């Protein structure tokens, strides 16, 4: 079977989320509870609430269980609290990153290079060169510029072989959005047959296009971690390349799969929103619905097809980076079905051979709304929204007050921008 | 007297235009610029938002090499059939006032400032040199860099204490609810204490986590257009120096005291951040006549504005929250109070030396915000503006088709949950 | 002042409002509860609740004739699980909201709640005028919502009085009246009988307003309570007098006449923006306490009767008291009176006079701006529900879950901007 | 292939145009018609405080005095010409006001295969009902008729045999309204309710009203009446010889199939959008609307939880199809305009397939999206206050429409 769902592995991170009113002396009453239980002001933030203006929002990221199981009791009865845990005990919500900076916590929790069947296994250089890229990811923290790497001549050859063979297929097999950005990457990035572009230059390009940014990663994270990073429009990226012995095969993601399959789509604004809704749906979702999201991600982002007029084309990264399947998925051999998440979430699939079937999406805006509807069925005691101004996640139990405030803004832009 | 500072070798010249990829657009245009000795480093081509078949172009040029550029605009408009807006900043005929297209572009004219014998501090090598030290930090500051921290002298902390202690006693009763709501937070996470001056870096990081607002060092006073323009990006140009210790209760210029105690606490409230942002957004490309009008509104709202809080009135203007005398005078029955109406406030005359004879009372920040939005329409501009926090760029909307797409995002945004 | 306190009849109208679920079989359980008492079915309505496929809305319109059979029914509905009820009465005040009509037809109930009976009236020593007034009173007392307004042949002495007021005022409208007035007036001259030498019929006028903004006229004998008069505006109904001032002093009238109402009020009701504004005032009066009715009467005074509006760099008048008064229309635009910006929190309590000209006037930025101020003031009025008018069914909707209906209005209006703008 | 689409037959010629008040337009226009010709209305525009809307009600008679006006209005100083017939570059005529529904309400017995053909009484009794419709005008109360005992029996046979199936086969909305119709409208096995009492009931629920009609109108006319929430209704009844068959709509089909749904507001809004979509639509798109109407209002099914039920009038008034559509025999597809609008169907035999709508609110928005696909130089919205249609052709009408929306966002938030 070998599905793409990777369970999350874990001192388990324990974080709290709660807001309180300023009617009685609230800041003093809460801060003293933390100082008395050996908690400095560095593991607690107090920010104003946007939904009432007379409330404070509190964030705690705590290693110290006996000093933590006592605050929850005194805090809940004497006055709403959401407990986030990485080990996901009962009566708790699965932990998720509240700010882009918190992505640094579990960015190095990949599994296991060390696979005997890997193409480049009987190679001391390649096996060692992989450790170099892994160290870049393990030591990278948010905000930092992605360290640049000088690719060897033997490695640019592999890139060239994959680049030239796929560039000939994009004009006819890739969706319009792909061919819309690709010329830009050829001019403003090092997207050339005889050059490998640096992830830093690409990240800076995405940031100026849709706000998406890249993050080095050593290997494969848990599905929870990966999708969680999409809520912040952060895409964990590998910096290594396949072994030059078989440029047309890879059991794992490499810079080729992600630069030629993933990056161009994240440059489109409509697609950035769609993929973001998938990540947003994973924040605090149980493991049962994470696998469902991983399956949707598989049949939409990696191996998804889209309707373009009277014809169909491909937009999945797994398809746009594979020379053989990109032609097989567009033929009349595979089975095509309309995109319906209730069926895709449970559909079984394989990772070794080509996909027997493909799901066709009407559009990205159409697929986006399907994710929102599916996000509602996911049992969560709150709603989530991303704030690009502060780059934090907003926990929303009365989420309805914020969506309306966004409409009142968008509507005043249609009557003001009235040229004629 | 007035607070309006008019805008003043290498005048920034920028173009704005979008094009369709019908046959080949990128190559045909890029060659048009390369043929006129324009390196690609001075041109960006990014996909247009709301339009999947258009490219958006950004150019970063100077007044230099204009004659090889005034010909390109003609080939883009007549030979291609597309709309183009020329930004020149130097009242070029048939041109739009230049404005920053990206937050990074704030670095261009951040040093375009204009030593007074009558100044509280006089020409004395000690103080004047300390002032030049802060000026060098601002001239050398860039958007990405962290604000350099400074070790304030005891003589400077003493002055801060005099202003801090005397004003803290009035905030609980004279300042609006939003002010007293944030101030306790600034005392813990920014070090707002009688015997300490907080660093703009620690403060800037605090606003970013509250409403996304960030601080920027400045040596002196910018043009009203330049200063207000930075508000569109929720960027507040901030001074790092402090008044001379001889007269702690007087300052002819803004200082770190005026900026930390008058301006910063309000920028921590999102409702106020949106309001102040609409003022900056309204200034992008506005004629000089309407820039002065916006400077007057900013004066009577952000600097010297009053707000209704229930059956009583309180103050939220920076000019009041940093002045010990006027903060008490504005709440008395001596000054004249009017309802906030921009058509009357935009033309109202005012003074900067003495207290304000009158004050304008705003119903709320969300109400005052929409009043600016309505006023933004009266400003003659060939386009509308909106800020994109994801990419930190301004999106110009000139084509009607861009609005039809904007309507789709709204009709879909009608989530009728109804429980 | 113009505030007239509300007076109830011996048979004070008592009506109930409540919705219930069809889970336990409510139609039978509720309908039978009334059948057990001396309550006829004809005085009970059961209608489906919109957006709640499993709820029925119930309306009952009775009075104190059967009180002992009514104080027991209300208890079974409120105390038992499944039903919330609002009791509307004209004067109990214990646990009831001030009564208001739920349907346009119910305006017939208190349409005859009148207080020419003043000795000092200009036409007092006149058997004809004194008698002619009773003739108009019978028309109002006998008028019902469905009937067409009876036409009357005005005497030549009465056409002359109208002409005196018409000619002297028409010369001032082009320069003193707001843009909306001079926009409608030419139409009234062509499609109605707005001429110097003719008095138009209220029926012809009512039909004209209905085709403009849906407003309709209703004959009235005299002065109603402020609640009754204002209440009728929620249905875009304007109570109108059909008589005319005495010809002895065409330039003076202590009471409203067809001149004040045809030349002052109707032309504004033809504009949608003003019709919506005045409607929000009526909507704000439904179920409002007597203390807030007087406050509402003051707003109406400084807006509809004696209100001024901003028109560009200049200001013009739109109040009916000014558009029908020859002296005040010139005095309000001069520099003698004091002008203040319109703020309901200030206007609601401002004192005023009715005999002499107004010392001050309130200037509104626009009709849409004044409308939103009334909505804001409507929230401060203590009411256990919100109100909205349904022009399709011509009924009032009591709304505690009002938030569910506003969304359907936005989602429709927005989907109409994408159909035309599909270019 | 028997179809339900009835082409329009002739002719009413009407004009629509707006003008500004800055220049002397009202005077210039009023003299323009008198100089070339009295039946003209001028009302203020509800979207521009400085514009007037003009309505003219003339016949094709005296055409040469009209072909000159169109040039002076278009070339000098926007105008839409409505012609009951296909004139080149003109929009199909549609009623602008509820009163205009009276014009072609008579634009429709002697049929050998009719059940009651060999009966002078029934054949004559039908002309009695036709005279009521031909002479009926808007605003009038629907004349009541005393139904004969022979006719009440026919109603009873259909009523009792179908009432037993509604609780299990009819949608939730139907059984929600039906108990009310039994008490306040007299829906009983041994009594036929009068259209006047029923119309008054619908008006108080969703504003829908009934209008007598002699026979079958053109699809445009019938659908057009739905834009005003007006439902053209037949007052006669099928011949008592075969109570379970009728080649035409009768009071049974209309009271038991159609009326109860019009009492639900969500359905009233949905059906109204269909009528609104037909105003000024070409003949090609009228048939498409007639097909959609067929598979939604007449023979439409809806999802009710994990089960499926029927809400179409053709099923709720037919004893055989009401059981056949739920018997898993026909094939069911999701409601999609591109597929349903062109699907062919029959009227004689049961339907081979049925289209399932998620809900009434879901089907309504699909029509609105489809309303854009109809080529029209304007958009339409209904004003219940004045009961006329608002044409939106000029850009100025939309900027004002944007203000009323942004302002309509009242954030009470408690
Ligand atoms: Cl966005
Ligand atoms: Cl925001
Ligand atoms: Cl309206
Ligand atoms: Cl409605
Ligand atoms: Fe991948
Ligand atoms: Fe300042
Ligand atoms: Fe009056
Ligand atoms: Fe039918």
Picking from B363, B262, B367, the residue whose alpha carbon sits closest to that of residue B313 is B363
Per the annotation, the verdict on B194 as an active-site residue is no
Q: CB-hemisphere CA count at 13 Å for C376?
A: 13
C-alpha A181/C-alpha A210 separation (Å) is 12
Number of domains in chain A: 1
- In 3D space, the residue among C332, C356, C358, C333 whose CA is nearest the CA of residue C347 turns out to be C358
Query: Whose CA is closest to B385, among A416, A411, A270?
Result: A416
Ligand 6 centroid to residue B380 C-alpha, Å: 27
Query: D384 contacts in C (CB within 8 Å)?
Result: 214, 391-392
Question: What is the token pair recorded at C331?
Answer: 């005095």
Pairwise CB contact (< 8 Å): D378 & C31:
no
The active-site residue out of C324, C325, C328, C386 is C324
User: Per the CB < 8 Å rule, is D392 touching C416?
Assistant: yes
The answer to the question of whether B258 is labelled as a binding residue is yes
User: By the 8 A CB rule, do B219 and B141 touch?
Assistant: no
Q: What is the dihedral of CA A187, A192, A195, A201, to 10 degrees?
A: 30
Question: E strands within D35-94?
Answer: 40-44, 51-56, 58-59, 79-83, 91-92
Of B127, B97, B176, nearest in space to B363 by CA:
B176
Please tell me the distance from the alpha carbon of residue D317 to that of residue D252, in angstroms, as a whole number: 7
**Residue (of B12, B18, B86) closest to B42 by Cα position:** B12
| Ligand 5 midpoint to CA A317 (Å) | 6
Beta strand pairing call for D79-83 and D91-92: parallel
User: Active-site residue A321, yes or no?
Assistant: yes
Q: What is the rounded CA–CA span in Å between residue B7 and residue B4?
A: 9
* DSSP state letters, D91-141: EEP--SBGGGGGTTTT-----TTSSTTS-HHHHHHHHHHHHHHHH--TTSP
Annotated binding site of C for Fe cation: 260, 265, 305
Is C417's CB within 8 Å of B407's CB? yes
Give the residue from C235, C200, C230 showing the smallest Cα distance to C215.
Answer: C235
Ligand-binding site membership of D298 (annotated): yes
Task: Return the CATH number at D223.
Answer: 1.10.800.10
DSSP E strands: which ranges in D347-408?
353-357, 379-383, 388-392
Query: Which burial class, exposed, middle or buried, applies to A141 when counting CB atoms under 10 A from its CB (0-12, 13-18, 19+)?
Result: exposed
Q: Do C212 and D43 touch (CB under 8 A)?
A: yes
Binding site as annotated, residues of C: 260, 265, 305
Q: Can you tell me the distance from the alpha carbon of D136 to that of D326, in angstroms, rounded to the nearest whole number?
A: 40
What is the SS3 assignment for A21?
strand
In SS3 terms, chain C reads as CCCCCCCCCCCCEEEEEEEEECCCCHHHHHHHHHHCCCCCHHHEEEEECCCCCCEEEEEEEEEHHHCCCCHHHHHHHHHCCCCEEEEEECCCCCCCEECCCCEHHHHHCCCCCCCCCCCCCCCCCCHHHHHHHHHHHHHHHHCCCCCCCCCCCCCHHHHHHHHHHHHHHHHHHHHHECHHHHHHHHHHHHHCCCECCECCCHHHHHHHHHHHCCCEEEEECCCCCHHHHHHHHCCCEEEEECCCCCCCCCCCCCCCCHHHHHHHHHHHHCCHHHHHHHHHHHHHHCCCCHHHHHHHHHHHHHHHHCCEEEECCEEEECCHHHHCCHHHHHHCCCCCCEEEECCHHHHCCCCCCCCCCCCEEEEECCHHHHHHHHHHHHHHCCCCCEEEEECCCCEEEEECCCHHHHHHHHHHHHHHHHHHCCC
Q: Which of C48, C368, C415 sits opposite D205 (nearest CB)?
A: C48
**CA pair distance C145, D105, nearest whole angstrom:** 28
3-state secondary structure of D153: helix
Tell me, in angstroms, the distance from the centre of ligand 5 to residue A188's CA: 23
Q: Ligand 4 mean position to B24 CA, how many Å?
A: 50
Does residue B258 have an active-site annotation? yes
Whether residues C418 and B407 touch (CB distance < 8 A) is answered with yes
Chain A residues in contact with C414 by the CB 8 A cut-off are 411
D216 phi/psi in degrees, rounded to 5: -100, 125
Specify the residue for token string 């004497």. A78
Task: Give the rounded distance of the alpha carbon of D315 from its chain centre.
Answer: 19
Burial label, A72 (beta-carbon count in 10 A; 0-12, 13-18, 19+): middle
Cα gap D398→D392, rounded to integer Å: 8
d(CA A203, CA A267): 10
Does residue A154 have an active-site annotation?
A: no
List the one residue out of A111, A121, A116 whose CA is nearest residue A246. A121
What are the angstrom distances between the C-alpha of D340 and each of D277, D292, D310, D337?
16, 6, 17, 5
- CA distance linking residue B253 with residue B38, whole number of Å: 42
Contact by Cβ (8 Å): B236, B263: yes
Cα-based angle A87, A90, A95 (whole degrees, multiple of 5): 40
| Cα separation, C300 vs A64, whole angstroms | 66
State the Cα–Cα distance between residues C45 and C30, nearest whole angstrom. 11
Q: How far is CA A351 from CA A246, A348, B223, in A?
A: 18, 10, 61
Catalytic pick among B263, B278, B283, B292: B263
Chain D neighbors of C56, CB-CB under 8 A: 180
Please report the sign of the dihedral spanned by the C-alpha atoms of residue A314, residue A317, residue A320, residue A325. Answer: negative
Q: Are C417 and D398 in contact (CB < 8 Å)?
A: yes
Are B54 and B22 in contact by the 8 Å Cβ rule? The answer is no
D412 touches chain A (CB under 8 A): no
**Would strands C338-341 and C360-364 be described as parallel, antiparallel, or unpaired?**
parallel
At A201 the three-state DSSP class reads helix
Is B156 a known ligand-binding residue? no
Q: At residue B416, what are phi and psi to the nearest 5 degrees?
A: -90, 90
- Strand (E) or helix (H) holding D304: strand D301-304
CA distances from C383 to A2, C37, C59, C74, C98 (A): 63, 30, 19, 19, 10
Question: Gaps after which residues in chain B, C–N over 2.5 Å?
Answer: 8, 114
Give the integer Cα–Cα distance in Å for B335 and B316. 16
Polymer length of chain A: 420
* b (16+ CB within 10 A) / e for A389-403: bbbbbbbeeebeeee
Q: Which of C411, C416, C420, C422 to mutate to test the interface with B (most CBs of B within 10 A)?
A: C411
Other beta carbons within 10 Å of B280: 25
Phi, psi of A305 (to 5 degrees): -110, 155
Strands (E), B293-406: 305-309, 312-315, 336-339, 358-362, 384-388, 393-397
Closest in D26, D172, D204 to C47, CB measured:
D204
Answer yes or no: do C390 and D41 touch at CB < 8 A.
no
Residue C351 and residue C305: Cα distance in Å, rounded?
A: 15
Q: Is some CB atom of chain B closer than 8 A to the CB atom of A365?
A: yes
Smallest CA–CA separation between C121 and chain B, in Å? 43
Range of the domain at D408: 1-414
CA distance D124 to chain C (A): 35
Contact: C417, D407; criterion CB under 8 Å: no
Question: Nearest 10 degrees: CA dihedral of A265, A266, A272, A277?
Answer: 90
Helix (H) or strand (E) holding A329: none
Q: Does B386 touch chain C (CB under 8 A)?
A: no
Q: What one-character DSSP code corresponds to residue B42?
A: G
A181, two tokens: 């950005």
Catalytic residue among A57, A83, A155, A302: A302
User: What is the A261 CA–ligand 4 centroid distance (Å)?
Assistant: 49
Residue of C265, C278, C285, C294 marked catalytic = C265
C-beta of residue C344 within 8 angstroms of C-beta of residue C314: no
Considering only the beta carbons, identify the residue of C51, C343, C423 that sits closest to B400. Answer: C423
Distance CA B212, CA B227 (A): 18
């Amino acid at each position: 079977q070998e599905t793409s769902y990777i369970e999350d592995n874990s001192n388990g991170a324990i974080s709290l989320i709660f807001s309180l009113k300023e009617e009685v002396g609230a800041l003093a009453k809460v801060l003293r509870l933390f100082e008395e239980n050996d908690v400095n002001l560095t593991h607690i933030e107090s920010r104003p609430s946007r939904l009432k203006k007379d409330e404070y929002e509190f964030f705690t990221h705590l290693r110290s269980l006996p000093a933590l199981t006592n605050i929850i009791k005194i805090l809940r009865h004497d006055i709403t609290v959401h407990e986030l845990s990485r080990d996901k005990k009962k009566d708790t919500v699965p932990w998720f990153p509240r700010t882009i900076q918190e992505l640094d916590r579990f960015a190095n929790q990949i599994l296991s290079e060390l696979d005997a069947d890997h193409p480049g296994f009987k190679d001391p250089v390649y096996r060692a060169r992989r450790k170099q890229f892994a160290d870049i990811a393990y030591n990278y923290r948010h905000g930092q510029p992605i360290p640049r790497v000088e690719y060897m001549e033997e490695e640019k050859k592999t890139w060239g072989t994959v680049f030239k063979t796929l560039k000939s297929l994009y004009k006819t097999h890739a969706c319009y959005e792909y061919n819309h950005i690709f010329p830009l990457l050829e001019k403003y990035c090092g997207f050339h047959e005889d050059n490998i572009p640096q992830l830093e230059d690409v990240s800076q390009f995405l940031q100026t296009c849709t706000g998406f940014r890249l993050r080095p990663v050593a290997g494969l994270l848990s599905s929870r971690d990966f999708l969680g990073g999409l809520a912040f429009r952060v895409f964990h990226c590998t910096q290594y390349i396949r072994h030059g012995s078989k440029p047309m095969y890879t059991p794992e993601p490499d810079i080729c799969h992600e630069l030629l399959g993933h990056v161009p789509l994240f440059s489109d604004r409509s697609f950035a929103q769609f993929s973001q809704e998938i990540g947003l749906a994973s924040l605090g979702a149980p493991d049962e619905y994470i696998e469902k999201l991983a399956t949707i991600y598989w049949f939409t982002v990696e191996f998804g097809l889209c309707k373009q007029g009277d014809s169909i084309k491909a937009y999945g990264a797994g398809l746009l980076s594979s020379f053989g399947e990109l032609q097989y998925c567009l033929s009349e051999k595979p089975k095509l079905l309309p995109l319906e998440l209730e069926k895709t979430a449970i559909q079984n699939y394989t990772v070794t051979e080509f996909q027997p079937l493909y799901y066709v999406a009407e559009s990205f805006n159409d697929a986006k709304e399907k994710v929102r509807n599916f996000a509602a069925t996911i049992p969560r005691p709150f709603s989530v929204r991303y704030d690009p101004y502060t780059q934090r996640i907003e926990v929303l139990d009365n989420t309805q007050q914020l969506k309306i405030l966004a409409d009142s803004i968008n509507s005043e832009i249609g009557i003001l921008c009235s040229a004629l």
